[PDB]
Amino acid sequence: KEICLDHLYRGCQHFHLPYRWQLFILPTWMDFQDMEYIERAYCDPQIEIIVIEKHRINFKKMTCDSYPIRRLSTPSFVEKTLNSVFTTKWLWYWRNELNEYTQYGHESPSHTSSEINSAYLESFFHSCPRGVLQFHAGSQNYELSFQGMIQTNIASKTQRHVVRRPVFVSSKDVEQKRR
């Protein structure tokens, strides 16, 4: 398990340059060509907008043709492998019609379930916190925006609040989980 930090110190799962410029083409972070030219423009604080071949890069929004961009710093960090009980598992919920929380992938009060689950959403959120994601539940289509922490029915436009919280682990749970 090896990470680099992006331009906002975000952990991202060395390279010949001290920097690596990428854009998110769902589901993969792709290397820009002309990384040194991008960096040189970026290091001029007067520059917001540049063109790199087919691409309009916007440093103020950190987007390129509406896709998120990032700058990885090269200094790598290697995880010290510990018992998995010390790793946080994140659950994802949406506010249902009974004004309660259903976990993604579990049954709504109307006997409907998303195909996406907490593991699917945490993996996408970790990779791409400014992501928007399409998903199915029952007979309906939805967009989830990590930035707004909302899901929207693409047909009706009804929004529901999204919440992300951990699986609870007590100090007792920690002792048991040391075999």
Next chain:
Amino acid sequence: KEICLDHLYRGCQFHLPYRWQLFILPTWMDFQDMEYIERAYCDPQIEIIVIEKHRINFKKMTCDSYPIRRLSTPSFVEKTLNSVFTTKWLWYWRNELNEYTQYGHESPSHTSSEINSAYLESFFHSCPRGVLQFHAGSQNYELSFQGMIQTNIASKTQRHVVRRPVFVSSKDVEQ
């Protein structure tokens, strides 16, 4: 050099898998009752918990208006690299010639802040939602990282703040 990641995977500078802290400049302070805080946090219905007459708001991640964070315990150790591969971040403000002056360098009026890029990057790394006071010439300013603005406390004139790296060429890397 060892880091761990917060609740939003941010790199930060334990017997539980979690460590709950609030930021009172200049220090991240440990909450007492970390396990009780975590138990409330793992209930997605809970936004407000009060402990010791201190009001935690999980929606804003504040406590009595100070930022809070939840550190994950798994540590990550820096791979030894030449320092030419380390990014240095410069901080600038929009001056009266609507050009950029680096913090700590002379304005068009021959005035300079005491604070510099190293001071601001260090504070920004620790506390991205930080608001801070600083002096330049004979005037006092507030700098909000979130707004990326400095405001003269007296006149209320705002100036835009920008953070960009020192440029390092592939040639610089070879030399």
